[PDB]
């Protein structure tokens, strides 16, 4: 609540509970590899 942001994106999708692990920087597995990749220097929040 103290900051300002240059631009903001909100990305949305559904996955299995045990795949939520893969939605983080530098992870791997079918989701991270073939569906949705975060950059290694990601700035942001993941919410599920």
């Amino acid at each position: 609540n103290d900051l300002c942001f240059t631009n903001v994106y909100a990305d949305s999708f559904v996955i299995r509970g045990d795949e939520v692990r893969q939605i983080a920087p530098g992870q791997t597995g079918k989701i991270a590899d073939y569906n949705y990749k975060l950059p290694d220097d990601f700035t942001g929040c993941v919410i599920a």
Binding site: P25, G26, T28, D40
Partner: protein, 48 residues
């Protein structure tokens, strides 16, 4: 020298470990390589 990294070969680190954790092993290794190169040039300035 290892400088307290898990091995002293960059290709070994990168084969053995995933990117978020390989990075701290590489960073530890390049810190010792900077210290040794910085030590060499300081001795060469004093000999010169």
């Amino acid at each position: 020298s290892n400088f307290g990294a898990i091995s002293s070969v960059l290709n070994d680190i990168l084969s053995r470990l995933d990117p978020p954790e390989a990075e701290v092993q590489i960073d530890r290794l390049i810190t010792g390589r900077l210290q040794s190169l910085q030590t060499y040039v300081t001795q060469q300035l004093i000999r010169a």
